[PDB]
Amino acid sequence: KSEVAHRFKDLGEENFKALVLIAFAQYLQQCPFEDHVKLVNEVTEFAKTCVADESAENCDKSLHTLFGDKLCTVADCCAKQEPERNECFLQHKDDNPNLPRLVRPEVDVMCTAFHDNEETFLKKYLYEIARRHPYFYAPELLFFAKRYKAAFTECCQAADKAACLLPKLDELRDEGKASSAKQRLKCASLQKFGERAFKAWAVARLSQRFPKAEFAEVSKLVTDLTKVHTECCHGDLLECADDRADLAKYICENQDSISSKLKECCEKPLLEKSHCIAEVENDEMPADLPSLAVESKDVCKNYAEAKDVFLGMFLYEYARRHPDYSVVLLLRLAKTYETTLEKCCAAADPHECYAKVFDEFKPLVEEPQNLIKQNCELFEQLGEYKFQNALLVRYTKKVPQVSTPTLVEVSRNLGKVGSKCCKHPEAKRMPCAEDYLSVVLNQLCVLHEKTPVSDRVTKCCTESLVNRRPCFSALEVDETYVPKEFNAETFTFHADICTLSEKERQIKKQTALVELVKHKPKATKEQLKAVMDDFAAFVEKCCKADDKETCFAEEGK
Ligand SMILES: CCc1oc2ccccc2c1C(=O)c1cc(Br)c(O)c(Br)c1
Ligand SMILES: CCc1oc2ccccc2c1C(=O)c1cc(Br)c(O)c(Br)c1
Ligand SMILES: CCc1oc2ccccc2c1C(=O)c1cc(Br)c(O)c(Br)c1
Ligand SMILES: CCc1oc2ccccc2c1C(=O)c1cc(Br)c(O)c(Br)c1
Numbered sequence: 001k002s003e004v005a006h007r008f009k010d011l012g013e014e015n016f017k018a019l020v021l022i023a024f025a026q027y028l029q030q031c032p033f034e035d036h037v038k039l040v041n042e043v044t045e046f047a048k049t050c051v052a053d054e055s056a057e058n059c060d061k062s063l064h065t066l067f068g069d070k071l072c073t074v075a076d077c078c079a080k081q082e083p084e085r086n087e088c089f090l091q092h093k094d095d096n097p098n099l100p101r102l103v104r105p106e107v108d109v110m111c112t113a114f115h116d117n118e119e120t121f122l123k124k125y126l127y128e129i130a131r132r133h134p135y136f137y138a139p140e141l142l143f144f145a146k147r148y149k150a151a152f153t154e155c156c157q158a159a160d161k162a163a164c165l166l167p168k169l170d171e172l173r174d175e176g177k178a179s180s181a182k183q184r185l186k187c188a189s190l191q192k193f194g195e196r197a198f199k200a201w202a203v204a205r206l207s208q209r210f211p212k213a214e215f216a217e218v219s220k221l222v223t224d225l226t227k228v229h230t231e232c233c234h235g236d237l238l239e240c241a242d243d244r245a246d247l248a249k250y251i252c253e254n255q256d257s258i259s260s261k262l263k264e265c266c267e268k269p270l271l272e273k274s275h276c277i278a279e280v281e282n283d284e285m286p287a288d289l290p291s292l293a294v295e296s297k298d299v300c301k302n303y304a305e306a307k308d309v310f311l312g313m314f315l316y317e318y319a320r321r322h323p324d325y326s327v328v329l330l331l332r333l334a335k336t337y338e339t340t341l342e343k344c345c346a347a348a349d350p351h352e353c354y355a356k357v358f359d360e361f362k363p364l365v366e367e368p369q370n371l372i373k374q375n376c377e378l379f380e381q382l383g384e385y386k387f388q389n390a391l392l393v394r395y396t397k398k399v400p401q402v403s404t405p406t407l408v409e410v411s412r413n414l415g416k417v418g419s420k421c422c423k424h425p426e427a428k429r430m431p432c433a434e435d436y437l438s439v440v441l442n443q444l445c446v447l448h449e450k451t452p453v454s455d456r457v458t459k460c461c462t463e464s465l466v467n468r469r470p471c472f473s474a475l476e477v478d479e480t481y482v483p484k485e486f487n488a489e490t491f492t493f494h495a496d497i498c499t500l501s502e503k504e505r506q507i508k509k510q511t512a513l514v515e516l517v518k519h520k521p522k523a524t525k526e527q528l529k530a531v532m533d534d535f536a537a538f539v540e541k542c543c544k545a546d547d548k549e550t551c552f553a554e555e556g557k
Contacts, residue, residue, distance in 0.1 A: 002059035004066065005050035007238040011245075015142065017044045018126060019237045022138050025130035026235065027071055027089045029097050033127050039070045063238060090235060093134035095184075095446045102128060107165050111156035122149055129176065137183040138237035139244050140278075143271050144176055181413075181443040187233035188442055193465055199226050200334065201465075203312060204319045204327040208431070210259045211285045211320035215313055217257055224250075248274045259283045282323050289321050294357055300345035311338055324427050326434035329368055331466045333361050371473075372422065372429045379418035385506065388415035392510060393528065396517040398472075400481045401454035406447050407514045408507065413440040437469050484518050491515065491535075495552055498543040509536060531557075 008016045020040045028036070043066070050059035058066070064086040072078040077088040114121045125148055130136055151172070155164035189198045202222040210218065224247055232240035251258055252266035252273070260283050265276040303310045315334045322330065337357065344353035379387045391411045399407075417440065421432035445461035452458055456478065460471040490512075497508060513532060517523070523531075535556065542551045 001054045002050045002056070003063055004047050004059060004061075005054055007063075007242055008047040008051055010242050011238065013044070013048075015241065016047060016238070017041075018142055018145065019138055019241055020044070021123060021126050022130040022136070022141060023067065023235055023237045024071065025127050026093065026134040026136070027067075028074070029094060029099075029131045029134060031074060033124055035074065036127060037123060039073075043067075043070060063236065086235070095134070095450055097132065099132065104169070107162040110165075111152065111161060114152040114156060118149075121152075133180045133184075135184050135187045135233060136180055138232050139241040139271075139274060140179055140183070142241070143275050144172065144179075146271050147172065181439050183229075183232075184446060185439050185442045186229050188446060189465060190230055190233055195226060195230065197465065198229075199223070200312070200315065200331060201327055202226060204315055204330045204334075207316045207319035208323045208327075209280065209282045211323075212260060212283050213258050215316045218316060219312070221251070221258070244274055245270055248277060251277060285321055285323065292358070294354060295351075297351065299354065300341075300350050303341055303345060307338075324430055325365065326368070326431045328434045328438060328466050328469065329365065329430065332364050335466065336360060336364065367470075368430055368434060372433045376418050376422040376429075379415075379422060384415055384419045387418060388412055388510065389513060389532075391415060392513050393517060393525065396514045397477055397521055398475045399454045399457050400478055400483075400518055400521060402448065402457060403451075403453065404511060404514050404518070406444065408510045409447075410440060410444040411510070412507075413443065434469065438465070441468055441472055478521075481521065483521055486519055491556065492553060493539060495543070495549040497539060497552070 011019065017040055020043050021036060024036045024039060046058075046066075050056050062082070065082050068078060068082060068085045068089075071089070072085075075092075077092065078085050079088065110121075122145060126141060126145055129141060129144075147168075151165060151168040155161055155168065158164055186198070189201065199222055202225055203218060206218055206221060206225075210221075213221075224243070228240055228244045228247065231237075231243070248266065248270070252262060255262040255266075259280070261281055262277065265280060266273045268276060311334065314337060315330065318333065319325075319327075319330050340354055340357050340360065344350045347353055378390065382390065388411045391414055392407065395411055395414075396407055414437070417433060417436045421436060422429055424432070441461075444457070448454070448457050448461070456475050460475060461468065463471055493508065493512075497505070500508075509532070512535065513528070516528065516531065538556065539552060
C-alpha cells in the first residue's frame, strides 16, 4: 500500500529522519541547512500520519512523487511528469559543487556545540557531507554518523580532548573520502555500463571473498546486492537502506552456506553488522579444487542454451581459486573466454579449436604482475611524497589540458596506493593495486566529466572499465599542447602560506609543480628539481625567518 509508511515502520524514526536529510542534501545541494530540516520534519510528521492509518490521504503516492513536491518549493527541474522530474535531479548532481570549504574549529569549541544542541550538531554533519558528495553511500553515512556521535560523547569529558578527538576525526576523514570515491565507482559502473557489466563485476569479487559458497547462493547474493546500489545511486535512499539492512539478516541467517568469517561479524548492532561484511576478509579456498570442465563435448551445448549462466559460472569457478588476481584482470580473462567461445563453437571441430584457451591467459595475467613490482621499486626508493611528484610530471605531460587542482588530487591518491598496499607480500599486490587504481581513475573521470578540456581523457574514461587502466598508462606525451602564457599571480604566494599546517604546504608545492609544467612542458626532469628546490627554499627561508610580508612577494624568475 503506502510505501512511505512501509519504510518508516522498518527503518525507524531515527533512520527515516536521517535518510531524508541525506536525500535532500544530495538533490538540492545549494539550499542552506535550515531549509532542509523544515522539509524533513514535514515529511517525518507526514510519515507518522500514514503509519497510524494506511488508508489516509496522499499516502499511496510513490516516494519520488512526494519528494519532488517538497523539493520544488524553492532550476526548471519540476518539468513534465514525475519520472522526468526525478531524473532531472540525478542529472544535476554536481560532483564538485564549488562550495566553500570546511574548516576544522578548535576542540573545545566543538564540544560546547555538541553539548549545547547534540541533535543539530549531528544533523548538520549529515547535511554538510551529503551536499559535497551527491553519490555518497546512504546507509554507510549513518554508520559514520554513529561513530561521529560516539567520538564526541567519549572524548569531550576527557582530560586531554585534543589527544583523542583529533586522532578519531583524522581517521574518520580518511574513511569517509575513501568511501566517497569507492561508492562513486559503483554508481558510474551502473549508469554508464548498465547492470550487465556491474553484475559480472560483483560475481568476481564475491567469489574471491566467499569461495566455500555455491554459485546458486552467490547468484542470490549478487542479484540482491546489485538491487541495493541501483537504488542508492538513483536517490532511493529509503529503499536502499532497507534492503541492505535485511540482507545482513539473510547473510547471517545461514553463515555456513555463505562463508566462515561471519561469527563475530554479526555479533554487532544493525549499523555495525552491515559494515563488517562490506570489508570482510576472503574465506579460505576449498582445497582439492579441480582444473577445468573446456574439454567436454557439452561446452558449446551449455553455452548456446544459456550464455550468461555458463559465462557466469566460469568466472565464479575461476575467481574462487584465484584470490591473488584482481577483478579487472579476471573480467579481462572472462571477456577473452567469451570471444574464444563464439568463434570456436560456430565451426565444425570446436574441441580442437578451444583446446589451448587457458594458454591465452598467460599474457593477460603477467601484464599487471610485471607492472606492480616495477612501479613499487621506485616507490620504496623515493618516498611517498617524491613518488607523487614523479607521478605529477608523469601525468601533467600526458594530459596538460586538465585543470590544475584535478591533477594534484588524482596523483596524491595514486601515490597513496603504493604506501598502503605494496608493503604486502606477493599475494595481495595484484588485487589491491588494480582495485585501488580503478577508484582513483574513476574519481578523475567523474571530476573531468563536469568540465571536460582534454580529449585523450574523455575517450580513456568512455572506454571499457576493464581496459580503463591500460589506456591511462601510455596516453602519449601530448606533443601538441601550446603552453599557457606566463602568469605571475599564480606563482606568487602570499604571506598566509605559512600559517597552514605541514600537510597543506605539500598540496601548495604540488599545485605549483603542475603550474610550472603548463608554462614550460619541454622542461627536463632535473631542470624541474632545481626549480622546485629553489621555490621551496625561498618560501622556507623567507617565512621561517622573520622578514615582513614583502619578502615573499618579490621576483623569483
Ligand atoms: C563543526 C565540526 C565539524 O562539523 C562538520 C561538518 C561536516 C563535516 C565535518 C565536520 C566537523 C569536524 O569536526 C571536522 C573534522 C575534520 Br578531521 C575535518 O578535516 C573537518 Br574539514 C571537519
Ligand atoms: C569527521 C569529519 C569528516 O567526516 C567525513 C565523513 C565523510 C567524508 C568526509 C568527512 C570529514 C572531513 O574531514 C571532511 C573534510 C573536507 Br576538506 C571536506 O570537504 C568534507 Br565534505 C569533509
Ligand atoms: C565482499 C566485497 C564486495 O565487493 C563488492 C563489489 C561490488 C559490489 C558489492 C561488493 C561487496 C559486498 O559484498 C558488499 C556488501 C555490502 Br552489505 C555493502 O554495503 C557493500 Br558497499 C559491499
Ligand atoms: C600506484 C601503484 C600502481 O599500481 C599499479 C598496478 C598496475 C599498473 C600500474 C600501477 C601503479 C602505478 O604506479 C601507476 C603508474 C602510472 Br605512470 C600510471 O599511469 C598508472 Br594508471 C599507475
